[PDB]
């Protein structure tokens, strides 16, 4: 009964970071060695866990979050970071326990002319709390007069398209990111490594 990591990492389509995807991994045997022993990732950072010791560990549940961001934004998917992504799209807690895995996806997510399907929230009055997902498309009021759903002066559409083209500098190319959260509650452990 293997954990369906293949469904998460090898998904034909990833979510936009503002509407990041969460998959609750539970009741399965998890071989994390298929991930660590893979020359496919540019980023593989773990927090509160050793990456090689993951196969010895047992968790209540594991969460697999996934989205697409720029290469220069992958550094914001870590505890204690600021920026448009950490502040208005996907926020990790300071006591984060889990892994952050990223890889270049220029061959899949960039289009000759611009993709436009991948978005990010550009306007938000306040920063997100950790693991908050805001999918509101309400017109952003930058002044004193209400917008009333009409894009215009001091009334912006809150989301912005990435517009990924294969002629972008590496730090501006699309990157697929999978964040694995490790949950440890006073309840039975449903996700254990191979025994």
């Amino acid at each position: 009964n293997l954990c369906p990591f293949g469904e998460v990492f090898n998904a034909t389509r990833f979510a936009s970071v503002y509407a990041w995807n969460r998959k609750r991994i539970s009741n399965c045997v998890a071989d994390y060695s298929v991930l660590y022993n893979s020359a496919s990732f540019s980023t593989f950072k773990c927090y509160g866990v050793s990456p090689t010791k993951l196969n010895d560990l047992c968790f209540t549940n594991v969460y697999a979050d996934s989205f697409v961001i720029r290469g220069d934004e992958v550094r914001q998917i870590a505890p204690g970071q600021t920026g448009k992504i950490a502040d208005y799209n996907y926020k990790l807690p300071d006591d984060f326990t889990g892994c952050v895995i990223a890889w270049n996806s220029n061959n899949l997510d960039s289009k000759v002319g611009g993709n436009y399907n991948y978005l990010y929230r550009l306007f938000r009055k306040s920063n997100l709390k950790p693991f908050e997902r805001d999918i509101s498309t309400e017109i952003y009021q930058a002044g004193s007069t209400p917008c009333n759903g009409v894009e215009g002066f001091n009334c912006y559409f809150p989301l912005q398209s990435y517009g990924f083209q294969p002629t972008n500098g590496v730090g501006y190319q699309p990157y697929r990111v999978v964040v694995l959260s490790f949950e440890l509650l006073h309840a039975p452990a449903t996700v254990c490594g191979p025994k």
Partner: antibody
Framework: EVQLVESGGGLIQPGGSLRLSCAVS????????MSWVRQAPGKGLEWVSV???????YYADSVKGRFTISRDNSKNTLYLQMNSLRAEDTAVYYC??????????????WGQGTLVTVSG | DIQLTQSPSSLSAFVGDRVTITCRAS??????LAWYQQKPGNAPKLLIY???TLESGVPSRFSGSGSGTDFTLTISSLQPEDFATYYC?????????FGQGTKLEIKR
Amino acid sequence: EVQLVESGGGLIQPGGSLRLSCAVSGFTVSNNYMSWVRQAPGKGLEWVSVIYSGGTTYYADSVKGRFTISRDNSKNTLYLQMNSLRAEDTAVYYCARGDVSGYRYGLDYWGQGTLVTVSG
Amino acid sequence: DIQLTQSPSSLSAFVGDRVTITCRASEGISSYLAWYQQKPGNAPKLLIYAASTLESGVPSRFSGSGSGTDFTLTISSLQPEDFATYYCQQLNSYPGTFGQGTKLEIKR
């Protein structure tokens, strides 16, 4: 009628400190990306710093550790605290609405400017 | 870092001339580019944003085109009030580098 009014500039010796203010009307400072841009005499434009509505701040590498952008939501005013001023900091400083990284709108409204002269 | 090369440094023209100002980024910055106009003793004024979107209130004679590395600002019919310095700006990443500028002067 959007209006951005800078003040606080003037003559100061190298090593000194100065605070610029920018009283705004026409948009809410606390709800916008607000930037500081400067122009040395006879030169081009140079972005200095930005504050996000959420609180995040960024600076240009030439002003890091010496300048601090901030605001007062109640007075709809933006500030720039300039410490350890150097001769090169001599420029007209402009406050503008907008950001310069993944912000396609550019800097749509700018103040008249305030001249800061750093000289001994 | 991203370098923007704006050309020419100066351009000579008459009222009624079609003028094109060029801007070349060192890497693909898609449509993250703005165009500003500045007159001596005055703050810059935004003309075009998102590479080709005309800013509200700006006259129709100003237009921008391009995406990636090569951008252009066109002034289809110069008016007396258009003799000024023009700047391109990359809005892709900090520090939002501005171009060196193009002074548009009177032909003689």
